[PDB]
Nucleic acid binder design. Structure first.
Ligand code: CA
Ligand code: CA
Ligand code: CA
Ligand code: CA
Lengths: 219, 211
DNA sequence: GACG
DNA sequence: GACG
């Protein structure tokens, strides 16, 4: 049975940040890739890496963080507080929320955000970020799900579950453009398309309200 | 230097229900915003995109059906966009576009291929029906066709293949061709910037495609 | 042209 | 572990 009905659109979501949870990191890059459920509802071996649906909305943004990028974040992601400021990137701010709001508003409701390790990373982090704003959270009315739980579940029914490992186990290919918000969100879409009807249903079953996610750290 | 140095280039691409004759409406819109400073052999390797870009890509339900030609080459149709729940070109889109523009240093200059004859007049027509003040007012625009001529057929693909001695990909998706456009524009970035600064014109002076 |  |  379904806790909240059928999610009308899935939003694959990926972030880059200044470091790992222990460093109370900040967002530096954010990608959203909105897909309607019909899009998710395969010939050959190894299985062709699936084409993205023809109809998707994509938002990819760069974000000046209020603190330095740890050296680790800098070398994996290719970003730095200093370069984003050279390119005049604005921070995680009220206008970024209206933007998110308007972007989310264009999607059939309700939404379900899907991030890889989202339960331990992107969600709580996004939650922390948004809590600083005075604009109402534009996420409070969405649902979320962590695609590590999904892939486990799905593979089980037919080992490492990091992004690339799964993508490589599934497709016998290397993921491209790793650690760019968009780059890795696409690879995430690829593995979620592995069994669309099965993932799509696993999502409906496990979706939970974003507002019940705890912030990574406090103010 | 009529309008100072553009701080942001926003490469712009659309899909639509057809060609100007048919009074088209927009079905797909893609914006690729690159800061000025992320723009400052043989055959030349296709250039890479800068690490820092902002991208917005949206499918839009048109009010009129697609012409058979527009469906053919774009893979889109009113019915599909609708059944998949795409909203119209509405006030919220205007609010979204604007929020996106607000994140860039000014002045922004739009860049589109044959934009003076297509995209710009088309967008202006779409935006004139809205109660929101246009988010594009105060922006600048330029036609990458004039740009590429001045720098050197001038179809998008012709140019790409002529500069990089190889084939484009992902045609007639708003994003597919916006990326292509990005490449040929970075063939000679510095020369491009200088020409853009020189020929940029206020979007708000662009006549509507139709009324 | 050259844009869909 | 897995997220940067
Ligand atoms: Ca991630
Ligand atoms: Ca990543
Ligand atoms: Ca075009
Ligand atoms: Ca196109």
């Amino acid at each position: 049975t379904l806790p909240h009905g059928h999610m009308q659109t899935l939003i694959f979501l990926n972030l880059e940040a200044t470091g790992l949870p222990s460093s109370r990191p900040e967002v530096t890059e954010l990608c959203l890739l909105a897909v309607h459920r019909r899009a998710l509802e395969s010939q050959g071996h190894p299985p062709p890496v699936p084409r993205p649906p023809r109809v998707v909305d994509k938002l990819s943004l760069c974000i000046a963080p209020g603190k330095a990028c740890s050296p680790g974040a800098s070398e994996i992601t290719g970003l730095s507080k200093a370069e984003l400021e050279v390119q005049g990137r604005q921070r995680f701010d009220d206008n970024l929320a209206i933007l998110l709001r308007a972007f989310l508003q264009r999607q059939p409701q309700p939404c379900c955000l899907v991030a890889h390790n989202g339960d331990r990373y992107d969600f709580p982090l996004l939650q922390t970020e948004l809590a600083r704003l005075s604009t109402p959270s534009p996420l409070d009315g969405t649902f979320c799900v962590d695609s590590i739980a999904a892939l486990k579940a799905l593979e089980q029914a037919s080992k490492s579950y990091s992004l690339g490992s799964i993508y490589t186990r599934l497709y016998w290919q290397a993921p491209t453009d790793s650690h760019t918000a968009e780059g890795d969100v696409l690879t995430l879409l690829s593995i979620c398309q592995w069994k669309p009807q099965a993932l799509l249903q696993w999502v409906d079953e496990h979706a939970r309200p974003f507002s019940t996610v705890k912030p990574m750290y406090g103010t």
